[PDB]
Amino acid sequence: SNKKAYLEKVSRDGIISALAFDQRGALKRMMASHQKEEPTTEQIVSLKRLVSEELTPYASSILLDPEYGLPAIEVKDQKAGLLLAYEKTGYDAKTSSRLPDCLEDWSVKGLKAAGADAIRFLLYYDVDGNEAVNHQKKAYIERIGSECQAEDLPFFLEILTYDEKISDNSSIAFAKVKAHKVNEAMRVFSAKRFGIDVLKVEVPLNMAYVEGFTEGPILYSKADAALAFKEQEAASHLPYIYLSAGVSAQLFQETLIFAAQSGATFNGVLCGRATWADVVSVYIKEGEAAARQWLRQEGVKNIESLNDVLAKTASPWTNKVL
Amino acid sequence: SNKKAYLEKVSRDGIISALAFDQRGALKRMMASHQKEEPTTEQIVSLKRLVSEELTPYASSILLDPEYGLPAIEVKDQKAGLLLAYEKTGYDAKTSSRLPDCLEDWSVKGLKAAGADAIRFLLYYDVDGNEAVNHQKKAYIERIGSECQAEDLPFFLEILTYDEKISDNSSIAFAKVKAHKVNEAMRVFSAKRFGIDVLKVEVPLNMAYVEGFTEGPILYSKADAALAFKEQEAASHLPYIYLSAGVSAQLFQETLIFAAQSGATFNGVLCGRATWADVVSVYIKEGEAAARQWLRQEGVKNIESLNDVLAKTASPWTNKVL
């Protein structure tokens, strides 16, 4: 009922131009690289509060995590929608099952009360894997989907693909099956039983092996690459958006341009490190005030450039909901 | 909202006179005591099929578990409703948190598809316990309450009380605080936030310590016992029913009579071991046919006696549902 009202609060002109900063494990790895000590709860909380304060005026919404991001919510722009992450971070590298789990302290009710306009759950999925594992996963998504129809909140399912016998996603071996993995997963979770409103997905290819985007060996010509984007768009009726996957800002913007040229009708992005990655080093080495002025200068032009590109490549989701 | 339609499907004349055989761990312990080998899946399934076959004509519904009870479903009486258990059996006895967990292969959607008219979740709760633990538990119940409001199925919450510093629920020390534990838990989960339709609860006392009912030490006069039942009735606006807690058939019936005399407005029972406990020994030691005739004689007389008692002591839930 009010799913479109909430969806409108995280969009702008029917396009989701959202800033992602839910990173937890990844954030303390970035921080640890620039200092001798372990990253403190203070540091994580303060940085998130800082990024929220300074960049949310230029985003339609922000994605945050309940673990460190609750103080960030109150300093956020009044025009920005709010997405909250629901899942526990990471996965056990000693098995290939990578089962999903919700934060112990939370429910969609609780997340809604904290100010969420939409819920994000991150799922690792292998369409070709053990289907006892996949049975349990689908059952879990069913549970959360039901929660979101009861609480009347849009459900963002983020799908990160992998292969149970390939450890390295950046490998050539994985790049040869990624399109299949991504597209078929979208096709699976388009089923109404899961109650998903928006899919958050990666681009169907490894752009580092696409003609023109690499300066070395290629797996795909530009024609075959466009086919992958076409197959991805035919794979679902649901609105979908792209994650940046930690690429450079420039690579990301060119990928969106290529995708639009290929026929992809993506409905926005949830972009993180490609926008703000460099602020981490500045914050840790030169302090909070310096970090603030980096965000007021190079941060704003990162996100403005992204918005500039999005304005010419992204398609409104209004066309995909009657 | 067909929640009341479903609730009617498990009732008879606004009274829930239901047969419970969801027991799993408890069942194999009962079976193990009577034979050298550990009880195998065939035996459990066959016994569930047998009890379901013979006793469901005298009950308004049956509670079963998805692990072993699905074959029992096709053989249950067709004027009898179906409840399915959602939670994993047992708890880790080496910690006091006793955290709740759903069966991984299932969702409320799936239980509905399997034929459920209602969903049962069993929760261990200590109102005086660690309240980080209790926060997590309440969050979990919120989730399932939401699931059930989406699938439009009645939510039965069974609450078993315990004390984090008392291992034995049948001890005198626990009997001294049991009324408080049960009644306050009922108040807690009466909140609209949890979405519960019917409470499955214990009697607020240990009857083996009540004046008139015991052959040993007395903890409660009959006046204090009646006060506990009155306090239980004021603790919730919701319909509630009693589990038998494995007492003898005659004691359970005497407890129900006392309860009604005290002013309790319980709306039926979900009775298991007090009805059919003795059949386990018969089934294991003298075979299936012998078990069949126990159920046809002493089993039928147990459950018919119970129905007789219920018709003069239990109150219709229609009075609590506007």
What one-character-per-residue DSSP string does A245-278 give?
Answer: TT--HHHHHHHHHHHHHHT----EEEE-HHHHTT
Using CB atoms, pick whichever of B104, B136, B150 lies closest to residue A150. Answer: B150
Name all domains of chain A by residue range, CATH numbers in brackets: 1-322 (3.20.20.70)
C-alpha distances (whole Å) from B151 to each of A98, A141, B110, B144, B154 are 28, 14, 10, 11, 9
CB-CB neighbours of B288 under 10 Å: 12
CB pair distance less than 8 Å for B140 and A110: no
Instruction: Indicate the SS3 state at residue B129.
Output: coil
User: Which run of H or E residues covers position B19?
Assistant: strand B16-20
State how far residue A65 is from chain B, nearest Cα, in angstroms: 17
How far apart CA A91 and CA A110 sit, in angstroms, is 24
CB-CB neighbours of A60 under 10 Å: 23
CB pair distance less than 8 Å for A107 and B151: no
Residues of B in contact with A150 (CB under 8 A): 146-147, 149-150, 195
Q: Are strands B268-271 and B240-243 parallel, antiparallel or unpaired?
A: parallel
Residue B163 gets which letter from DSSP?
Answer: B
CB pair distance less than 8 Å for A143 and B147: yes
> CB–CB of A35/A284 below 8 Å?
yes
> CB–CB of B274/B248 below 8 Å?
yes
How far apart CA B183 and CA B200 sit, in angstroms, is 12
Q: Resolution of the experimental model in angstroms, please?
A: 3.0
Spatial CA neighbour of A211 closest among A199, A223, A193: A223
Spatial CA neighbour of B103 closest among B151, B69, B127: B69
Residues 6+ positions from A27 with CB-CB distance below 8 Å = A39, A44, A47, A280
Using CB atoms, pick whichever of B106, B139, B150 lies closest to residue A149. Answer: B150
How far apart CA A186 and CA A190 sit, in angstroms, is 6
The token pair that represents B255 in the structure block: 């407890």
The token pair that represents B114 in the structure block: 């399997």
The token pair that represents A154 in the structure block: 């849009």
Chain A contacts to B (CB-CB under 8 A)? 102, 104-110, 135-136, 139-140, 142-143, 146-147, 149-151, 193
How far apart CA A251 and CA A213 sit, in angstroms, is 8
CB pair distance less than 8 Å for B146 and A151: yes
State how far residue B143 is from chain A, nearest Cα, in angstroms: 6
Rg (CA), chain A: 19
Residues of A in contact with B113 (CB under 8 A): none
C-alpha distances (whole Å) from A295 to each of A16, A35, A276, A288 are 21, 21, 8, 11
How far apart CA B33 and CA B39 sit, in angstroms, is 10
Chains A, B: CB contacts under 8 A, how many? 57
How far apart CA A239 and CA A233 sit, in angstroms, is 10
Bridge partners of residue A200, in order along the sequence: A158, A241
Bridge partners of residue B201, in order along the sequence: B242
CA torsion sign for A162, A166, A172, A174 is: negative
How far apart CA B216 and CA B173 sit, in angstroms, is 15
Query: Own/partner pairs for B304-311, CB < 8 Å, 24+ apart?
Result: B304/B58, B305/B249, B305/B253, B306/B17, B306/B249, B306/B252, B306/B253, B306/B269, B306/B271, B306/B275, B307/B17, B307/B58, B309/B253, B309/B256, B309/B257, B310/B15, B310/B17, B310/B256, B310/B268, B310/B269, B311/B15
CB pair distance less than 8 Å for B135 and A105: yes
State which amino acid sits at residue B172.
I
What is the widest separation between alpha-carbon atoms in chain B?
54
Spatial CA neighbour of B5 closest among B273, B208, B197: B197
C-alpha distances (whole Å) from A303 to each of A189, A200, A259, A270 are 30, 19, 19, 11
**Which of A99, A106, A107 has the most B C-beta neighbours within 10 Å, making it the best mutation to test the interface with B?**
A107
State which amino acid sits at residue B286.
E
Q: Which residue has the tokens 């590109």?
A: A309
CB pair distance less than 8 Å for A139 and B193: no
CA torsion sign for B113, B114, B118, B124 is: negative
Q: Which residue has the tokens 């039965």?
A: B156
Residue B2 gets which letter from DSSP?
Answer: T
Half-sphere exposure of A108 (CA within 13 A, CB side): 26
Residues of A in contact with B105 (CB under 8 A): 135-136, 139
State how far residue A155 is from chain B, nearest Cα, in angstroms: 14
How far apart CA A171 and CA A182 sit, in angstroms, is 16
